[PDB]
Amino acid sequence: LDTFLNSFPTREFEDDNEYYWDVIGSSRRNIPLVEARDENGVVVAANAAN
Amino acid sequence: NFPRQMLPFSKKTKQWRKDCLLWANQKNYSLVRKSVIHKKINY
């Protein structure tokens, strides 16, 4: 168990408070649609024209 | 811990020397020096 824990390095912190590390995703994203309307203002159903 | 230094020179092989360097990355206190944070506050 020590030879398993001798495989890991050690960072010397400054305090004994809790510590943080920032994680990030991407910037590029696709946005879902919630509804669409034609020019007169009424929403387009699934059984509608072009 | 720190590898056995009291060896013959033939058994101070390449993984023995590597275990000593690998130790330094895994663990400061000195008896006549101030702490680094005390010196860096001075600087």
From Swiss-Prot, chain A:
The chain holds residues 52 to 101 of 504 of the full protein. Displays an HK-97-like fold with an insertion domain that protrudes at the capsid surface. The lineage of its organism: Viruses, Duplodnaviria, Heunggongvirae, Uroviricota, Caudoviricetes. It comes from the Viruses. It comes from Bacteroides phage crAss001 (Bacteroides phage PhiCrAss001). This is Major capsid protein. Capsid protein self-assembles to form an icosahedral capsid, with a T=9 symmetry, about 77 nm in diameter. Each asymmetric capsid nonamer is covered by 9 capsid auxiliary protein, 1 copy of the trimeric head fiber protein and 2 copies of the dimeric head fiber protein. Interacts with the auxiliary capsid protein (via FD region). Interacts with the head fiber dimeric protein. Interacts with the head fiber trimeric protein. Interacts with the portal vertex auxiliary protein. It is found in: Virion.
From Swiss-Prot, chain B:
It comes from the Viruses. It is found in: Virion. Forms the portal vertex of the capsid. Probably involved in head assembly, genome packaging, tail attachment, and genome ejection. Homododecamer. Interacts with the Cargo protein 1. Interacts with the major capsid protein. This is Portal protein. It comes from Bacteroides phage crAss001. The lineage of its organism: Viruses, Duplodnaviria, Heunggongvirae, Uroviricota, Caudoviricetes. The chain holds residues 6 to 51 of 806 of the full protein.
